[PDB]
Amino acid sequence: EQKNAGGVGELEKKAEAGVQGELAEIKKIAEKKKDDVVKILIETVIKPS
Amino acid sequence: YGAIYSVSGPVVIAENMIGCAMYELVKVGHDNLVGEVIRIDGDKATIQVYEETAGLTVGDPVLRTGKPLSVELGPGLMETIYDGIQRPLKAIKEESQSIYIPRGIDTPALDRTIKWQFTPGKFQVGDHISGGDIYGSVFENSLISSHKILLPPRSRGTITWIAPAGEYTLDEKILEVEFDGKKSDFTLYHTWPVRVPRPVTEKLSADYPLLTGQRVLDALFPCVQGGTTCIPGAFGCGKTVISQSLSKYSNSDAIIYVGCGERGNEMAEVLMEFPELYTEMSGTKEPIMKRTTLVANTSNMPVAAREASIYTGITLAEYFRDQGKNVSMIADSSSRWAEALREISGRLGEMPADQGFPAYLGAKLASFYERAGKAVALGSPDRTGSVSIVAAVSPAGGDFSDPVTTATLGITQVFWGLDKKLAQRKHFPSINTSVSYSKYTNVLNKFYDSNYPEFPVLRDRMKEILSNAEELEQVVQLVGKSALSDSDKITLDVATLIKEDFLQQNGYSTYDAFCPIWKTFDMMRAFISYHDEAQKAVANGANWSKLADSTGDVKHAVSSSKFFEPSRGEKEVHGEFEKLLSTMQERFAESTD
Amino acid sequence: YGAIYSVSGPVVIAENMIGCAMYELVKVGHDNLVGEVIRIDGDKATIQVYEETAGLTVGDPVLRTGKPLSVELGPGLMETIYDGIQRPLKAIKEESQSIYIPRGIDTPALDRTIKWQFTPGKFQVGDHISGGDIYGSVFENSLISSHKILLPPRSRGTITWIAPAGEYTLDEKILEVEFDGKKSDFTLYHTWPVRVPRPVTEKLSADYPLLTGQRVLDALFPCVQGGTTCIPGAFGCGKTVISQSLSKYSNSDAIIYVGCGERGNEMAEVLMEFPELYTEMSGTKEPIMKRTTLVANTSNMPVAAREASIYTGITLAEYFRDQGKNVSMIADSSSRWAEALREISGRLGEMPADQGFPAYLGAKLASFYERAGKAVALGSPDRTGSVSIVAAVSPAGGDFSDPVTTATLGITQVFWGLDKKLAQRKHFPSINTSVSYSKYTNVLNKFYDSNYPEFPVLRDRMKEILSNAEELEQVVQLVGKSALSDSDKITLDVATLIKEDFLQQNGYSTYDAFCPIWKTFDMMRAFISYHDEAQKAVANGANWSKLADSTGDVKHAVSSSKFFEPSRGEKEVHGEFEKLLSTMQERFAESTD
Amino acid sequence: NTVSGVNGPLVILEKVKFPRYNEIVNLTLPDGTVRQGQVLEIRGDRAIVQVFEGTSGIDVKKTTVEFTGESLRIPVSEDMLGRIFDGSGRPIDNGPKVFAEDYLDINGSPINPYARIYPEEMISTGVSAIDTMNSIARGQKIPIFSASGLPHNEIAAQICRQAGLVRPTKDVHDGHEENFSIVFAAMGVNLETARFFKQDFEENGSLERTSLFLNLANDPTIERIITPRLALTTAEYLAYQTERHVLTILTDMSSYADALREVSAAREEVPGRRGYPGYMYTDLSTIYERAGRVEGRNGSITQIPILTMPNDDITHPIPDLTGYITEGQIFVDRQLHNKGIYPPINVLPSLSRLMKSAIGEGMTRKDHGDVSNQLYAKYAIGKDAAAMKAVVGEEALSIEDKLSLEFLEKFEKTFITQGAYEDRTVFESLDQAWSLLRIYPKEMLNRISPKILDEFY
């Protein structure tokens, strides 16, 4: 049980550390390809589909 | 609005019906009979009219009510006898000089003569309030929890007008809600279409029992609120008794009784008996009836009301579940609700499936079971309430191999086998340990072990002992009882006490058919301690005759156990059992040596 | 050309059809799905499109091919795998990267990629030729030319141009025919509509041995060359199992396997297993497969492929018979073919008969069986061939009275059973004698007597033993083994032994090995011998126990004999069977006195 | 356009003729709620739709129709495990979203590539009665035939949970080299059931292991039929693209069949035997065809459908049809359940005709198949003897019968009796099975080849 009273601390520490780096790269790689996708989306709309 | 194209039987088709929904409540003719649109082909709407379409020429007007057929949920349900689509039978008795409702007589679902005292909640104007949050309450009961008024599900907004404390009528507005201009006014009741399930915060599995107050239910295989259960039919020489007793002995907060399509002798008995009988927990003001809300249909009532009967009852049960209460839905019988489907199908021209019963049957049962169950009630501080369905399924082919029974048992997790021969001799209830099962056993037995009883040990052992007894009885017939050991004789001796005290209870006496869930556990404790000790003692050098003379007084007490009072100091610990345990240990040294 | 008017289910209605034959093949929509014209209502022709439709638009194009759903008969049918709508399955894998048919593929009927070696016939320039004549031949196998190039039926003339010896492709011309100028060129393949049977010279009596190589058939009710057979049974019946054995052992020069709507894994197994295993008359590279062609179709693969399976396959068979080959056609199952019809009758809205299957069922099965039989090949060289049809069906829950099984039984002259109880103990296939008959049994025994075995004399006693065994078993059940006589005990034992050693084809090491009519005969000499000597012995005074324990070794030996490979002295009479005969003789004598 | 009428689950649209078969349309209610449906029948200037969601409230000129202009395909991703979905092509649970890298059709042939090579790899459930007597393979289809007095959900969960622990023990043995994935789909079962299942998967392992599709009984019959189709798309992608073995647990299969039955009753479609459709064969097939090894031949979809029989008969249309199609039959018995056997699997009619495909020999014994046949045969005789013991008594039964009555009792109580978490390896099971055979003498074990009996006894 002590691995389950101290495991509620670990309930967020390992959840946060688990994607601490991944949420920084998702938001990083988005800001690059943002503009590049937006031009494609604009293009599809002003082209009759 | 529309004009009648045809009346062919009780089915009436009408043209010039636009924006007509597919559950739309409509009133047909000048007379204003109740009807509902099952189907639409083109411009023409095909209506089943539940009342006689006699005197209705083609060309009469059809007036939309402008909304589906709904049921009203709010104050003044309890102590009222109703139709399958909720129409007070009681109110017709006052006006019409009729029990039943005759054609061309409709009335509102809730009485508007009655006024109830509305008390505001914890929300005031300018507060945002959300779906199901407790806006107020009405108190009109003192024996049970009353009608706590919720903001209508799937409705949100900021409250422009919250009426202050005082008496208002059910009809009259007490709320206006601001959500994109004036959202509408709302009243003390809410309308909800009954062929739509009511939402709740979330649904959960059941785990939580309550006082059933019939010993055999708890003891043989526990009775749970938020359960799914099948009980066999008998057509009022056995069916009626168990239903009347379940309503009376169970001290569940509400009970909602639904007679789907009954004889009419059974409907007549439940209404007269409820004020007459006494609560098992104390209080007057028409004891059991005050806790009861009744939907009572004989087979003579319109067929749509018979089909509708369970749906309206289930919505009722679901409404009280959001207040936080434990409800018993006792429905009798699904075979009779099913009979309605069959009739309605042939009238439309629908092609059914097996034995003439439609195919809408199996899915409608599955949908029905899931509305019932345990849930955390909706409303801001949250409570727990339950809806437990015990549905009888009678003969519908003279066997139990017919589509209605076979479909239900499958979804159901519990079967309780009434015994006919014992029932004809008027022991009620008298459940057979052979046919019966509960798949709820495991989770529940763990729940009672938590609470204080030794329940898992005793229940399991109860079953084994009886099963074992049939097998040993056969060895007595064919070989003889004399060549068999003392141990085996004992296995039978104990089974007979378990059979006599629990199983053969008489619901015509309250010192023989009403005892609390703890009390029922204490009796069962008593018999098990004796079995082990009796087998232990015969091994160490005793005989059946010797054993019987020696146990004496403790054996006599266990035999006399049912006659004892629900209390002795508390109704949870019965002092006479706790001291009985000592007298048994002292007796065992003496007997054995 | 035509334009889709409607798609209601798999049924499509298209206007602007001035014509079209019956069951005309079409390519529907831009997708190019399979269809056939069943009916015509006005100008709108109702065409069922049988390849799965989830995305066909109304007013998509409709292309008539101009001829009915047909098959190509020509070179490269052997060791080449096809569907029931004659698409090569191998061609699809490569192109499509869809191992099975995906929605919307149009792959031509044969392989136009594999060059074949053509040599010229006894018909040179200026010579008359007529349908079914051997115009030439194509090398396909390592041991024999499979596909004898026939002039098609309904063509005739004198040959102006005979191509010389060399390699050519399938679409290139190789034959020119004179009759009213250039009647046309001919190519290596020829076409034929599969709803027309191929015409023969004459049909000939069926009385010539068909060795299927399975002990259990040979022993009880053999088939004939020219045969028709029904076999019922439902999963665990060993029908896949008996197909594989059947293909390996079969004396016929072609076997055509028809998968009517199979598991897919079952088709995957038999395909792999023919080149993994070796043939009994030898086979160089893909041994068994060299003689095997598969029509395979799975359970959701096109309803046309499944419906056409029996006709595509029977047409193949008739063409091999016109070539001068003996064909054993296995179809599995005609019952899955029957489901294709049940589905067709609903979609169209034609009225069906009993069990929701149409009435046209009975004609369609009958037409298939009548084209089977033994015949003298059409064409001038003249040869003898057969098509012996073994057709699998399935009971509806142990009910053998279902329309499909009854219909097939109507047409058949041989019936071979399948008993559920006996399959559970592992004896599948399970043929007795009260669920099976063969009209060929009488002539067939006369032909086997000639070849060497004593079979007819042993066949009669063998039938009797089984027939008495069943009746005697009913007394054991009810009365007990206390009402028996000693000779009746004997009938019970010998019977149990027969049940295991013929009917069971289940392994214990290895699936059982090729047992001929000769092998089968030896088993019968040893069982029948055991029974005679033992009954004499009991009649003449002797213990049951003495006799059964003494046979002992001999019983183990017959059980396991079939696992051991044939020839162990000879095929004819094995040394292992020869020696038992002496052992019985020695025992009989010890027992008597 | 606008709704013309509505007759049951069928909706009559008055429209224009441009729509294609199973093209999505969205019905806009006057509440402003949108519900989805697909056209089942199209005709000139009109349609019949079946709406997945709902079946009532549908108006006339106050309602509107809008075309999506894409026929239904399921959005499939391979990141689907651990993620909560609802049986409707999206989560209405508010669970993690589906995403799409392919959208794949449920018609029963998208690009379908299956078995040209039959299963040869053994996959174990940790349960002796399953594994030994019938065997399970990397494409095997085995129906769980259950009843209204058996608890179908407890056995369903039992087979799945114990096959997840055994399956990595088998990976190490080199029976496998690829991932295991579970796809669990529950269609139109009770709330009580749904909750239970999720709780079971968590205890044994986790819910990261499995993907969940949840469909509620209150949601229509039309929804229920699409629910397994969604499971099929999930499994085919995983096998095809990422060479994973996929295990599908399809509960309840009977639930799906009743749904078919409803759209021929409130249709003018004439039904076949016992009120079950004539085109019932095709509906069932669609699920079962999409099974076997998937192209690359390291991927697979293996099926365990779960059938609850309502009458418990073997003359009912659902159990019969399923059985001809499926590669095995597993029959679970009420009488064993009563007696106190868990799992309470009766092998008296459990049979596989594709018994060879089902067994393994390169990661299981060769002796596995030989022993199983003998066991089954000896169990059956032991049942014939049981009926005879009641009738005749022990007052005429033979020396041989007595051995067979003992075998029957030892066989139920040892082999079929296993703990709730106790998993048996297939090799250990043989040892157990050999204990069962060992009481019979060398003349009663006569049917078996001499080689095997002298080797292992």
Next chain:
Amino acid sequence: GNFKSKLKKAMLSQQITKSTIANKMRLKVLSAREQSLDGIFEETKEKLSGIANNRDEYKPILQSLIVEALLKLLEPKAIVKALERDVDLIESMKDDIMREYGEKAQRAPLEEIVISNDYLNKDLVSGGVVVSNASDKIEINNTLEERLKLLSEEALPAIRLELYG
């Protein structure tokens, strides 16, 4: 006995947390993956309104949105519901549409485009038009949000291949 059940119970609570950590991560990831997609989608309909509000650049786009819808419409009269700013733009190019339709059909030229007195919102629609039936039964919503959203169905796997492939 009851030791074994308390011994399992704590190992169960151990794996309920391993599972809840693992679920919070797929939830943080998924909702981050979407937050990015809904900011790409956000920028495109902001960019588009700026295109729409310079009338002369919107003029050939609008012509094409209508011609497109009209070929799915297949009626001689279309009722076009527009914003109060685009009714003036449609008016000044009705002939061009009916020309342009005619050249891309073989059905018949379009007879009329109907400028109705009912209009689309400007606080619910950013720009674009709803081209509808003769009796307003079926409509092709060639509004900026609706096009962007349907386009989202097909954009999502493309965006997924270039972003995580």
